[PDB]
């Protein structure tokens, strides 16, 4: 299949009673995921908290976040996890179109990296309906453009929290810097220099997510390698080398230490 634009649709088969563990996976863009049928359990490993998501539940993973969570099937049916990615072009468009200004903002919900909402059952119907049609030339892109223009506007003023921030974030600068030269052997001095800062906002943004400097770079390269596997055709050796890993062994180790699957197994989950 071809690529996409402002919205990335990726559906995965949830093997009944299989655990989907994620250890420090980098979330490059905003992502929401929900199950089409059945039920499942969501376990966040950072905060010792569990959840029971249903077909009416939706989960948000914020951009530039380091996630440590797990998802486990609780249904006899091969559940169909739909993961939708929201790129920056819709983020800047959504942030402007909303002319509202919150008088009291729940800063706890703004600092959290894994939100959970139970949508109106009417919205779940519109959810899987438009997703099953994607995509058309700037035609299906506008169908989800209008849906999330009202869904996010509703949930933001309902919870009195900004869930999709605009730009200007220290993690966005580090991420786009490393991705501008993914194969470069980035060190600490290269990040501080081209960002015109020192280890005050730097180490804190690493300690706030519980990752070393090397751990962050590896997780950025994992998600970059995943975006290459999304095309459909690519040998693991090229994916490892074009993502910045010196050897296929260290790429497979970090990938399995991040996705809890072999890199070839994720290629089978796609096709």
Author numbering: 2 to 272
Provide the authors' original text about this structure.
Toxigenic Vibrio cholerae causes disease by producing the primary virulence factors cholera toxin (CT) and the toxin coregulated pilus (TCP). Most AraC/XylS-family members, including ToxT and AraC, contain an N-terminal regulatory/dimerization domain and a C-terminal DNA-binding domain. We present here the crystal structures of the V. cholerae master virulence activator ToxT in both the UFA-bound and apo states.
Crystals of ToxTENV256 K231A were produced in the same crystallization condition as wild-type ToxTENV256 and belonged to the same space group with a single monomer in each asymmetric unit. However, a subset of crystals was found to have slightly different unit cell dimensions. While no conformational differences in the DNA-binding domain are seen between the UFA-bound and apo structures, differences are seen in the regulatory domain. Amino acids Thr138, Gln139, Tyr140, and Ser141, that form part of the loop between helix α2 and helix α3 in the UFA-bound structure, form an additional turn of helix α3 in the apo structure. In apo ToxTENV256, helix α3 is more parallel with helix α2 and is in better alignment with the structure of the dimerization domain of AraC. The mean B-factor of the α-carbons in the apo-ToxTENV256 structure is 40 Å2 higher than that of the UFA-bound structure.
